[PDB]
Each structure stands twice: as C-alpha cells, then as structure tokens.
Amino acid sequence: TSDLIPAPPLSKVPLQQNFQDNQFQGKWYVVGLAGNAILREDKDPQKMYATIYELKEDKSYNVTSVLFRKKKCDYWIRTFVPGSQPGEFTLGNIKSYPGLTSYLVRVVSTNYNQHAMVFFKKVSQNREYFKITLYGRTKELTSELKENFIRFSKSLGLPENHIVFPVPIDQCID
Ligand SMILES: [Ac+3]
C-alpha cells in the first residue's frame, strides 16, 4: 500500500530554452529537493549531496552522485541520454534497474554558472514518482531562488512538508 501525490502533466513543467549541454557540465550541489516521495524529517535532516554531469563524446551525460552515509562516501552512476528536445533526457540501460519502466529528466531553468531546477519523473514497480532538484554551483543560494523553488514545487501539487533544503556538509561533496 502506497498513496502518492500524482505526477503533474509535462505541460506544467517548463523546459530551459536553448539548453547548452556543455555549460551544464561539472559539479552541482543539491540545495533543494521536492517530490511525491520526499518528506521533511526534523529527526534526521537530509544532508546535502552533489551530482556531477560529464558530457561523453556521444553527448549523453555520465551523472555521478556522491552522498555521505554511514561515515562513507557512496557514489551512484546514471547515464542521461538526450531525449525529445535539448534539455530533456531518458535513462541509459534501464534493463539494469529492477522494476524501472520509465525515467524522464527535464531541465526546467538554469543560468549554468549559479543555479538550476531539474524535474525528474519515473515509474518504478508501477508507481509514478516525481521530484524537482534545486541545484547550486555553491552550497548556498539566495532566499529569492529558494522561494522560487518552493513556488514551482507547490504549482506541481507538492505541499511544504514534501520540500526540503538539505543541510550543507563538507564530507564527500567538496
Ligand atoms: Ac533517482
């Protein structure tokens, strides 16, 4: 048994105009995280993690995420394959992820050198999950970019308790 806020229609999710795949590369901090499986946990607050985007020769991304868990750095690797339009991706080698039938990435907005908002949607065990990440080139962003991210998350049907601001750390992500 699982009850989820429904994924929004893709029509409610803007695409960054004239996306530049080369400028999106490098390290992003996860400064904000919202979604239908994200819950605030005042007990054990979510620690910031980082995601590195590297363009391969075929223009897919190697996407490496690093998080600090159980006193160690945990790495996870994804391939993002260019999809229907610049700034949209599907997941490479979906067969290797048990239960995963669908995975979509849309870059909603970025200025490449400070911030980005990225929409993800997937179907895993026939359940439809979506999330939005607010990416920072640094571990802090303005109140203005954070409130913009809260506004965008709420427009997609998420309440406040499905919106978190991971806490800055130094381990693994520097
Ligand atoms: Ac995922």
Side-chain angles (χ1 to χ4, degrees), residues 61-68 71-74:
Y61 287 115
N62 279 151
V63 181
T64 305
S65 288
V66 67
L67 71 79
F68 184 55
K71 294 185 160 158
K72 292 209 186 173
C73 304
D74 300 341

mmCIF file with all atom_site columns, all heavy atoms in Angstrom, residues 61-74, unseen atoms left out:
data_model
loop_
_atom_site.group_PDB
_atom_site.id
_atom_site.type_symbol
_atom_site.label_atom_id
_atom_site.label_alt_id
_atom_site.label_comp_id
_atom_site.label_asym_id
_atom_site.label_entity_id
_atom_site.label_seq_id
_atom_site.pdbx_PDB_ins_code
_atom_site.Cartn_x
_atom_site.Cartn_y
_atom_site.Cartn_z
_atom_site.occupancy
_atom_site.B_iso_or_equiv
_atom_site.pdbx_formal_charge
_atom_site.auth_seq_id
_atom_site.auth_comp_id
_atom_site.auth_asym_id
_atom_site.auth_atom_id
_atom_site.pdbx_PDB_model_num
ATOM 1   N N   . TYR A 1 61 ? 25.196 12.154 -20.939 1.00 0.00 ? 61 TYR A N   1
ATOM 2   C CA  . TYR A 1 61 ? 25.912 12.506 -19.688 1.00 0.00 ? 61 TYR A CA  1
ATOM 3   C C   . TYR A 1 61 ? 26.202 11.240 -18.917 1.00 0.00 ? 61 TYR A C   1
ATOM 4   O O   . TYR A 1 61 ? 25.280 10.412 -18.742 1.00 0.00 ? 61 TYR A O   1
ATOM 5   C CB  . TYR A 1 61 ? 25.093 13.428 -18.787 1.00 0.00 ? 61 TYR A CB  1
ATOM 6   C CG  . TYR A 1 61 ? 24.970 14.851 -19.238 1.00 0.00 ? 61 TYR A CG  1
ATOM 7   C CD1 . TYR A 1 61 ? 23.739 15.368 -19.594 1.00 0.00 ? 61 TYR A CD1 1
ATOM 8   C CD2 . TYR A 1 61 ? 26.063 15.724 -19.206 1.00 0.00 ? 61 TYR A CD2 1
ATOM 9   C CE1 . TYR A 1 61 ? 23.587 16.701 -19.920 1.00 0.00 ? 61 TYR A CE1 1
ATOM 10  C CE2 . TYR A 1 61 ? 25.912 17.051 -19.524 1.00 0.00 ? 61 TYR A CE2 1
ATOM 11  C CZ  . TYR A 1 61 ? 24.665 17.541 -19.899 1.00 0.00 ? 61 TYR A CZ  1
ATOM 12  O OH  . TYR A 1 61 ? 24.493 18.868 -20.233 1.00 0.00 ? 61 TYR A OH  1
ATOM 13  N N   . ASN A 1 62 ? 27.415 11.141 -18.401 1.00 0.00 ? 62 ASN A N   1
ATOM 14  C CA  . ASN A 1 62 ? 27.716 10.355 -17.197 1.00 0.00 ? 62 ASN A CA  1
ATOM 15  C C   . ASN A 1 62 ? 27.396 11.234 -15.987 1.00 0.00 ? 62 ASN A C   1
ATOM 16  O O   . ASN A 1 62 ? 27.935 12.347 -15.881 1.00 0.00 ? 62 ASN A O   1
ATOM 17  C CB  . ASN A 1 62 ? 29.169 9.873  -17.167 1.00 0.00 ? 62 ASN A CB  1
ATOM 18  C CG  . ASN A 1 62 ? 29.376 8.628  -18.002 1.00 0.00 ? 62 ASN A CG  1
ATOM 19  O OD1 . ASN A 1 62 ? 30.466 8.409  -18.532 1.00 0.00 ? 62 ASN A OD1 1
ATOM 20  N ND2 . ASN A 1 62 ? 28.332 7.818  -18.152 1.00 0.00 ? 62 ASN A ND2 1
ATOM 21  N N   . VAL A 1 63 ? 26.508 10.768 -15.149 1.00 0.00 ? 63 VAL A N   1
ATOM 22  C CA  . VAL A 1 63 ? 25.983 11.540 -13.998 1.00 0.00 ? 63 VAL A CA  1
ATOM 23  C C   . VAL A 1 63 ? 26.373 10.771 -12.752 1.00 0.00 ? 63 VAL A C   1
ATOM 24  O O   . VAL A 1 63 ? 25.889 9.628  -12.589 1.00 0.00 ? 63 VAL A O   1
ATOM 25  C CB  . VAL A 1 63 ? 24.465 11.727 -14.088 1.00 0.00 ? 63 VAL A CB  1
ATOM 26  C CG1 . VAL A 1 63 ? 23.908 12.550 -12.903 1.00 0.00 ? 63 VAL A CG1 1
ATOM 27  C CG2 . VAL A 1 63 ? 24.059 12.336 -15.426 1.00 0.00 ? 63 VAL A CG2 1
ATOM 28  N N   . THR A 1 64 ? 27.274 11.324 -11.951 1.00 0.00 ? 64 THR A N   1
ATOM 29  C CA  . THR A 1 64 ? 27.745 10.686 -10.729 1.00 0.00 ? 64 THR A CA  1
ATOM 30  C C   . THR A 1 64 ? 27.235 11.497 -9.548  1.00 0.00 ? 64 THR A C   1
ATOM 31  O O   . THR A 1 64 ? 27.568 12.700 -9.457  1.00 0.00 ? 64 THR A O   1
ATOM 32  C CB  . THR A 1 64 ? 29.275 10.578 -10.760 1.00 0.00 ? 64 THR A CB  1
ATOM 33  O OG1 . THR A 1 64 ? 29.564 9.891  -11.954 1.00 0.00 ? 64 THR A OG1 1
ATOM 34  C CG2 . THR A 1 64 ? 29.853 9.842  -9.576  1.00 0.00 ? 64 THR A CG2 1
ATOM 35  N N   . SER A 1 65 ? 26.579 10.851 -8.605  1.00 0.00 ? 65 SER A N   1
ATOM 36  C CA  . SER A 1 65 ? 26.145 11.493 -7.345  1.00 0.00 ? 65 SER A CA  1
ATOM 37  C C   . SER A 1 65 ? 26.973 10.932 -6.205  1.00 0.00 ? 65 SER A C   1
ATOM 38  O O   . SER A 1 65 ? 27.406 9.773  -6.289  1.00 0.00 ? 65 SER A O   1
ATOM 39  C CB  . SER A 1 65 ? 24.712 11.344 -7.125  1.00 0.00 ? 65 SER A CB  1
ATOM 40  O OG  . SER A 1 65 ? 23.980 12.168 -8.032  1.00 0.00 ? 65 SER A OG  1
ATOM 41  N N   . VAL A 1 66 ? 27.345 11.788 -5.275  1.00 0.00 ? 66 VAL A N   1
ATOM 42  C CA  . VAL A 1 66 ? 28.086 11.373 -4.079  1.00 0.00 ? 66 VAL A CA  1
ATOM 43  C C   . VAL A 1 66 ? 27.326 11.871 -2.863  1.00 0.00 ? 66 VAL A C   1
ATOM 44  O O   . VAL A 1 66 ? 26.945 13.048 -2.836  1.00 0.00 ? 66 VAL A O   1
ATOM 45  C CB  . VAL A 1 66 ? 29.563 11.832 -4.114  1.00 0.00 ? 66 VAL A CB  1
ATOM 46  C CG1 . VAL A 1 66 ? 29.713 13.309 -4.028  1.00 0.00 ? 66 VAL A CG1 1
ATOM 47  C CG2 . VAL A 1 66 ? 30.367 11.147 -3.043  1.00 0.00 ? 66 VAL A CG2 1
ATOM 48  N N   . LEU A 1 67 ? 27.072 10.977 -1.933  1.00 0.00 ? 67 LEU A N   1
ATOM 49  C CA  . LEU A 1 67 ? 26.474 11.300 -0.619  1.00 0.00 ? 67 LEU A CA  1
ATOM 50  C C   . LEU A 1 67 ? 27.294 10.684 0.505   1.00 0.00 ? 67 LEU A C   1
ATOM 51  O O   . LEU A 1 67 ? 27.992 9.704  0.280   1.00 0.00 ? 67 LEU A O   1
ATOM 52  C CB  . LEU A 1 67 ? 25.002 10.870 -0.573  1.00 0.00 ? 67 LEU A CB  1
ATOM 53  C CG  . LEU A 1 67 ? 24.682 9.394  -0.521  1.00 0.00 ? 67 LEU A CG  1
ATOM 54  C CD1 . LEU A 1 67 ? 24.850 8.825  0.889   1.00 0.00 ? 67 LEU A CD1 1
ATOM 55  C CD2 . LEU A 1 67 ? 23.227 9.183  -0.966  1.00 0.00 ? 67 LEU A CD2 1
ATOM 56  N N   . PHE A 1 68 ? 27.227 11.317 1.654   1.00 0.00 ? 68 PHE A N   1
ATOM 57  C CA  . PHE A 1 68 ? 27.842 10.906 2.917   1.00 0.00 ? 68 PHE A CA  1
ATOM 58  C C   . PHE A 1 68 ? 26.811 10.143 3.702   1.00 0.00 ? 68 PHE A C   1
ATOM 59  O O   . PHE A 1 68 ? 25.886 10.802 4.152   1.00 0.00 ? 68 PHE A O   1
ATOM 60  C CB  . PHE A 1 68 ? 28.266 12.127 3.719   1.00 0.00 ? 68 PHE A CB  1
ATOM 61  C CG  . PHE A 1 68 ? 28.991 11.837 5.004   1.00 0.00 ? 68 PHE A CG  1
ATOM 62  C CD1 . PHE A 1 68 ? 30.134 11.034 4.998   1.00 0.00 ? 68 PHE A CD1 1
ATOM 63  C CD2 . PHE A 1 68 ? 28.645 12.498 6.179   1.00 0.00 ? 68 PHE A CD2 1
ATOM 64  C CE1 . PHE A 1 68 ? 30.850 10.828 6.160   1.00 0.00 ? 68 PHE A CE1 1
ATOM 65  C CE2 . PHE A 1 68 ? 29.371 12.294 7.339   1.00 0.00 ? 68 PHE A CE2 1
ATOM 66  C CZ  . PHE A 1 68 ? 30.465 11.455 7.331   1.00 0.00 ? 68 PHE A CZ  1
ATOM 67  N N   . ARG A 1 69 ? 27.000 8.830  3.837   1.00 0.00 ? 69 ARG A N   1
ATOM 68  C CA  . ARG A 1 69 ? 26.125 7.878  4.561   1.00 0.00 ? 69 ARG A CA  1
ATOM 69  C C   . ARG A 1 69 ? 27.012 6.941  5.364   1.00 0.00 ? 69 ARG A C   1
ATOM 70  O O   . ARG A 1 69 ? 27.943 6.336  4.747   1.00 0.00 ? 69 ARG A O   1
ATOM 71  C CB  . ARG A 1 69 ? 25.293 7.041  3.565   1.00 0.00 ? 69 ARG A CB  1
ATOM 72  N N   . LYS A 1 70 ? 26.719 6.756  6.652   1.00 0.00 ? 70 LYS A N   1
ATOM 73  C CA  . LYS A 1 70 ? 27.355 5.704  7.489   1.00 0.00 ? 70 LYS A CA  1
ATOM 74  C C   . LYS A 1 70 ? 28.864 5.928  7.468   1.00 0.00 ? 70 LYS A C   1
ATOM 75  O O   . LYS A 1 70 ? 29.599 4.969  7.220   1.00 0.00 ? 70 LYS A O   1
ATOM 76  C CB  . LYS A 1 70 ? 27.019 4.308  6.951   1.00 0.00 ? 70 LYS A CB  1
ATOM 77  N N   . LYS A 1 71 ? 29.279 7.183  7.583   1.00 0.00 ? 71 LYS A N   1
ATOM 78  C CA  . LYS A 1 71 ? 30.698 7.617  7.698   1.00 0.00 ? 71 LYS A CA  1
ATOM 79  C C   . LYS A 1 71 ? 31.465 7.387  6.373   1.00 0.00 ? 71 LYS A C   1
ATOM 80  O O   . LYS A 1 71 ? 32.641 7.614  6.362   1.00 0.00 ? 71 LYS A O   1
ATOM 81  C CB  . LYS A 1 71 ? 31.335 6.934  8.898   1.00 0.00 ? 71 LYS A CB  1
ATOM 82  C CG  . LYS A 1 71 ? 30.722 7.378  10.228  1.00 0.00 ? 71 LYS A CG  1
ATOM 83  C CD  . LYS A 1 71 ? 31.400 6.816  11.469  1.00 0.00 ? 71 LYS A CD  1
ATOM 84  C CE  . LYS A 1 71 ? 31.080 7.635  12.710  1.00 0.00 ? 71 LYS A CE  1
ATOM 85  N NZ  . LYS A 1 71 ? 31.270 6.856  13.954  1.00 0.00 ? 71 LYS A NZ  1
ATOM 86  N N   . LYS A 1 72 ? 30.788 7.077  5.278   1.00 0.00 ? 72 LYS A N   1
ATOM 87  C CA  . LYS A 1 72 ? 31.470 6.853  3.982   1.00 0.00 ? 72 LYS A CA  1
ATOM 88  C C   . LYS A 1 72 ? 30.877 7.699  2.861   1.00 0.00 ? 72 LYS A C   1
ATOM 89  O O   . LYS A 1 72 ? 29.743 8.143  2.966   1.00 0.00 ? 72 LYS A O   1
ATOM 90  C CB  . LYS A 1 72 ? 31.472 5.352  3.685   1.00 0.00 ? 72 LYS A CB  1
ATOM 91  C CG  . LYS A 1 72 ? 32.368 4.571  4.645   1.00 0.00 ? 72 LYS A CG  1
ATOM 92  C CD  . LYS A 1 72 ? 32.930 3.343  4.059   1.00 0.00 ? 72 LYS A CD  1
ATOM 93  C CE  . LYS A 1 72 ? 33.692 2.512  5.067   1.00 0.00 ? 72 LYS A CE  1
ATOM 94  N NZ  . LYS A 1 72 ? 34.097 1.225  4.465   1.00 0.00 ? 72 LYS A NZ  1
ATOM 95  N N   . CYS A 1 73 ? 31.605 7.796  1.765   1.00 0.00 ? 73 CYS A N   1
ATOM 96  C CA  . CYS A 1 73 ? 31.130 8.411  0.517   1.00 0.00 ? 73 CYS A CA  1
ATOM 97  C C   . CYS A 1 73 ? 30.527 7.303  -0.330  1.00 0.00 ? 73 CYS A C   1
ATOM 98  O O   . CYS A 1 73 ? 31.229 6.317  -0.607  1.00 0.00 ? 73 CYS A O   1
ATOM 99  C CB  . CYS A 1 73 ? 32.247 9.126  -0.226  1.00 0.00 ? 73 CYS A CB  1
ATOM 100 S SG  . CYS A 1 73 ? 33.079 10.395 0.787   1.00 0.00 ? 73 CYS A SG  1
ATOM 101 N N   . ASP A 1 74 ? 29.258 7.443  -0.660  1.00 0.00 ? 74 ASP A N   1
ATOM 102 C CA  . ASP A 1 74 ? 28.508 6.498  -1.535  1.00 0.00 ? 74 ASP A CA  1
ATOM 103 C C   . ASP A 1 74 ? 28.303 7.174  -2.884  1.00 0.00 ? 74 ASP A C   1
ATOM 104 O O   . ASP A 1 74 ? 27.682 8.243  -2.929  1.00 0.00 ? 74 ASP A O   1
ATOM 105 C CB  . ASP A 1 74 ? 27.155 6.115  -0.939  1.00 0.00 ? 74 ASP A CB  1
ATOM 106 C CG  . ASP A 1 74 ? 27.238 5.433  0.414   1.00 0.00 ? 74 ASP A CG  1
ATOM 107 O OD1 . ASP A 1 74 ? 28.352 4.917  0.767   1.00 0.00 ? 74 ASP A OD1 1
ATOM 108 O OD2 . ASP A 1 74 ? 26.194 5.376  1.096   1.00 0.00 ? 74 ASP A OD2 1
#
